[PDB]
């Protein structure tokens, strides 16, 4: 009966962020998690500088209601270091250093030329239009906190501070396997009542795109000795171990009694569609997640449950799943109260540019193609029933795992 | 006047031919690869007829007896009932199992009453009900995915379900990348008189790499005609695109301009955008060239809005390779000046009535890079538009994974 929301918090409350770190050049850090706060070695900007193209003025010389002749120029990398007579001003550009004694800067459009110099319109508050040493970042301060996922937004900032490498948390290692007589490897021919192993690929691909180190142990022979050996291998080299299918999620069999002999594992019945079963627990040196065999449920269950667990473990201080947005359906949606339903939709603009969702087609877990046709989940509240054109609907766009 | 972003974009894309050279890779190595030849099913999906429900495989005659029905067997998962089934008796079956030879319908267990002399049923049974059927999802010889599809977690596991191990994808686009200038220092050594740290090259390298290109970083080239030429000759002979990330002229006259003019036909555009303006583009002997401005915010925007879509098209992708825009209200006043299509940065968030709105990240000048980190979207303000007051509709474009 249990809820998604309750399963999630149970999993995450049990889990401890990793802290082993390594130090890497900036070009190697995309998607990695900072292990320590980055601290600025210098001030930004270097020197007080002008915010506008215009004139630098003393405040005395302004109140004198008399046009100020231009003594000179200050640009980005030729300051004005001549002398500066009273009753004059200095031409200056944005980013140029303010010359000594400068109290304020006035936009060019906000003076006017006169025969005997420049005249100032508006009034002139002291310190105005000056960018002060360190107003953006001061030396000693924390530019980015530990726990930050590094991206093109942050790494060029770190490089402008002159820093070549930063310490980041090591990648989460995840071991992955499947099991079952029916499963064939892709390239052989399809036996008795047999299918191609797909889940293990979906999960391997998802893990790699999430930044994990993956140890794929293949399809394990349908035999308790082979399964135990697989678990001992997986557990000894990973932080998380994932059965992508065919280990029990509930049903009593030899796969279950080997799980119970190998750690504290709980088996859950979750109030979602598609999906329902999911196994989770500690082995001796790693967490375990067991997925149901159905691809859709396996893929949904991984994305909504395993993905957030991996984010917490990686050290990320961020909610590692796209946020939702309320939107109008252009489609009748069939839906059955009782279960939190992650349907799949297609999000696109109406002719006014506002966003709405069409369904992809049938929402049954006998086909995988709704992930490809879709670009989002329609997340229909647990107790809601059907849904008609024009109603209001929660929506989670697919992250990069689907595009 | 001034040239519009759209016009420039059009000009770059109309001149460019998608790559067609190709490699054959195992499915685990295709994430983000452009499929090169259509994927054609070798098989029916589902193979074999099969059940949509847990329940019982009946026969229409045995039902309308009115009369309870002993279970003679089970059909499972990867283990079917391939052993005889006698009149008057039903069969137990789980979702996804082969229906037995002779099955005519299936009843979900919810419409049965377990009886003593065997199983009883309800609501009468429509013919073929809950049977799925060989080939009804995909037929053999059909195109499942067409060439030009970016392969992803959505497509690859389906390609595997069809028994396929390897597919041809278009080879990665190769992009050479440098910067030039005595001003420029490596994070590493210390900061001489006018000097800065070279950030743009890092930025572009990180983007290229996440776009899935093959990057060839030639580093900082010395202020010297022969060094600069050599780099172009080498970059141009190894790559499909060559990008200067700063330091090569985007229009001002210098030794770099004359070299450019000498090694291919380069145009020097001024775009009606902000931030930015100057961009360089054109053909070299065996490669395209994009020449970015020096300011970091400017080079980042320009890469993101022009170079990124050119790469998507070179790559063979048949999808226009950038987020899409949506209409949303501002909750900030936005200072904007007519004349330039302004790509401001904003923070797109939900309010207390759950409607999506945009705020500004703060100051929008090109002297700081923080807006990329603080924001999660561009506010894409129209070229002739003036300031924008709280409450007005505004076009917004979420940041793609390059920024989070």
Curated annotation (Swiss-Prot), chain B:
InterPro entries: MoaB/Mog-like_dom_sf (IPR036425), MoaB/Mog_dom (IPR001453), MoCF_biosynth_CS (IPR008284), MoeA-like (IPR038987), MoeA_C_domain_IV (IPR005111), MoeA_C_domain_IV_sf (IPR036688), MoeA_linker/N (IPR005110), MoeA_linker/N_sf (IPR036135). Its cofactor is Mg(2+). GO terms for biological process: Mo-molybdopterin cofactor biosynthetic process. It is an enzyme of class 2 (transferase). Transmembrane segments: none annotated. One of its GO terms (molecular function) is molybdopterin molybdotransferase activity. Its EC number is 2.10.1.1. It catalyses: adenylyl-molybdopterin + molybdate = Mo-molybdopterin + AMP + H(+). Pfam families: MoCF_biosynth (PF00994), MoeA_C (PF03454), MoeA_N (PF03453). Coiled coil: none annotated. Pathway: Cofactor biosynthesis; molybdopterin biosynthesis. The keyword Magnesium applies. The keyword Magnesium applies. One of its GO terms (cellular component) is cytosol. Binds 1 Mg(2+) ion per subunit. Keywords: Magnesium, Metal-binding, Molybdenum, Molybdenum cofactor biosynthesis, Transferase. NCBIfam families: Glp_gephyrin (NF045515), molyb_syn (TIGR00177), PRK10680.1 (NF007960). Homodimer. Interacts with MobA, MogA and MobB in vivo. Belongs to the MoeA family. Catalyzes the insertion of molybdate into adenylated molybdopterin with the concomitant release of AMP. This is Molybdopterin molybdenumtransferase. It comes from Escherichia coli (strain K12). The gene is moeA.
């Amino acid at each position: 009966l249990m809820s998604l929301d309750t399963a999630l918090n149970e999993m995450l409350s049990r889990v401890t962020p990793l802290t082993a770190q390594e130090t890497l050049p900036l070009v190697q850090c995309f998607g990695r998690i900072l292990a320590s706060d980055v601290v600025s070695p210098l001030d930004v900007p270097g020197f007080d500088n002008s915010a506008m193209d215009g004139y630098a003025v003393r405040l005395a010389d302004i109140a004198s209601g008399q046009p100020l002749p231009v003594a000179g120029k200050s640009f980005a990398g030729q300051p004005y270091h001549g002398e500066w007579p009273a009753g004059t001003c200095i031409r200056i550009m944005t980013g140029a250093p303010v010359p000594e004694g400068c109290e304020a800067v006035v936009m060019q459009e906000q003076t006017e030329q006169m025969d005997n110099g420049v005249r100032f319109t508006a009034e002139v508050r002291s310190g105005q239009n000056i960018r002060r040493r360190g107003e953006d970042i001061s030396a000693g301060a924390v530019v980015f906190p530990a726990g930050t996922r590094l991206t093109t937004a942050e790494l060029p900032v770190i490089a402008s501070l002159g820093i070549a490498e930063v310490p980041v948390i090591r990648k989460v290692r995840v071991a992955l396997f499947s099991t079952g007589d029916q499963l064939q490897l892709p390239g052989q021919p399809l036996g008795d009542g047999q299918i191609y192993d797909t889940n293990r690929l979906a999960v391997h691909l998802m893990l790699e795109q999430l930044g994990c180190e993956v140890i794929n142990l293949g399809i394990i022979r349908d035999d308790p000795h082979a399964l135990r050996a697989a678990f001992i291998e997986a557990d000894s080299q990973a932080d998380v171990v994932i059965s992508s299918g065919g280990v029990s999620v509930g049903e009593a069999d030899y796969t279950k009694t080997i799980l119970e002999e190998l750690g504290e594992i709980a088996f859950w019945k979750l109030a979602i569609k598609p999906g329902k079963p999911f196994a989770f627990g500690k082995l001796s040196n790693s967490w375990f997640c067991g997925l149901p065999g159905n691809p859709v449920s396996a893929t949904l269950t991984f994305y909504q449950l395993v993905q957030p667990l991996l984010a917490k473990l990686s050290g990320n201080t961020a909610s590692g799943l796209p946020a939702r947005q309320r939107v109008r359906t252009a489609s009748r949606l069939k839906k059955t109260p009782g279960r939190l339903d992650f349907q799949r939709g297609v999000l696109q603009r109406n002719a006014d540019g506002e966003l709405e969702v069409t369904t992809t087609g049938h929402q049954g877990s006998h086909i995988f193609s709704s992930f490809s046709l879709g670009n989002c989940f329609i997340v229909l509240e647990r107790d809601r029933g059907n849904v008609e054109v024009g109603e209001w609907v929660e929506v989670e766009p697919f992250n990069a795992l689907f595009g």
